[PDB]
């Protein structure tokens, strides 16, 4: 039913005009894909889906030094739960250069992450609720994504 | 469930790797928005959703000379059915410049077109079926969209 667009600059967090609940979609667009980027410490780039209460419903990190994409969750004041790891970054982004896009479907119990056209994980949710906040911080000056990441949310799909 | 990406150059028509049936989504991205474009004859820009049989499930035209966005349908060898018109183009694209995006939801009986974040029409379907082809032709050298239009399809949503 609805389509929202957001310009998320590296380091920001935009509150959603409409929350991404079950059945909904959210895609992150990067007009750059720097996989040569220097040493990140630790997450060269993270993309998060928060709850109204700062709870990390999902944490998507990109670590080039560890050549791995990390997936996790955490209560607002709690500790990082059980990680997850998909190995070999560049190989997930193969297919498209110069740009990239990360799609996160919300299937109620699980978050399906898809990089470009390839599903990278069917991540089972640790924490729960509905996403009301997004974030895109480069935990070390060499984001594998462009200085700005567009974000489109397809909500009201139900 | 699935995410497909397509680079549709002005004048082309890409066959979908997966068809956009009911419940599915398809968004067109233009990295340019030329609303100053010259006289178009007649549709400065059209975006179509076809059936395997060349049937136009939906025709989205942009006419700057007529300052109107047209919506229609036609059998492969049939005539243009009952048109539809949303007036004042520039006003639909307000909100975002330099770029633009046209989203078409498929609600079985109706196609909801959304330009950027604004729903422009809840178009009731004349013809039926499922889309297997897309097209983006500039019916006169001054497309209001960039020379290339990315297209992302969110299918397998069911």
Curated annotation (Swiss-Prot), chains A, B:
Tissue expression remark: Detected in the fruiting body.
Gene3D superfamilies associated with the record: 2.60.120.200
GO terms (BP aspect): apoptotic process; positive regulation of apoptotic process
Domain of life the protein comes from: Eukaryota
Record-level Gene Ontology MF annotations: DNA nuclease activity; polysaccharide binding
Chain segments annotated as transmembrane: none
Residue ranges constituting the Galectin domain according to the UniProt record: 12-155
Keyword annotations: Apoptosis, Hydrolase, Lectin, Nuclease
Binding annotation for N-acetyl-alpha-neuraminyl-(2->3)-beta-D-galactosyl-(1->4)-beta-D-glucose: 43, 59, 63, 72, 74, 80, 83
SUPFAM superfamilies (alphabetical): Concanavalin A-like lectins/glucanases
Entry EC number(s): 3.1.21.-
Residues annotated with Blocked amino end (Gln) modification: 1
SMART domains reported in the protein's UniProt record: GLECT
Quaternary structure and interacting proteins, as annotated: Homodimer.
Function: Anti-tumor lectin with DNase activity. Inhibits the growth of several tumor cell lines in vitro. Induces lymphocyte infiltration and necrosis of tumor cells in a mouse tumor model. Induces apoptosis in HeLa cells. Binds N-acetylneuraminyl lactose (N-acetyl-alpha-neuraminyl-(2->3)-beta-D-galactosyl-(1->4)-beta-D-glucose).
Name this polypeptide is given: Anti-tumor lectin
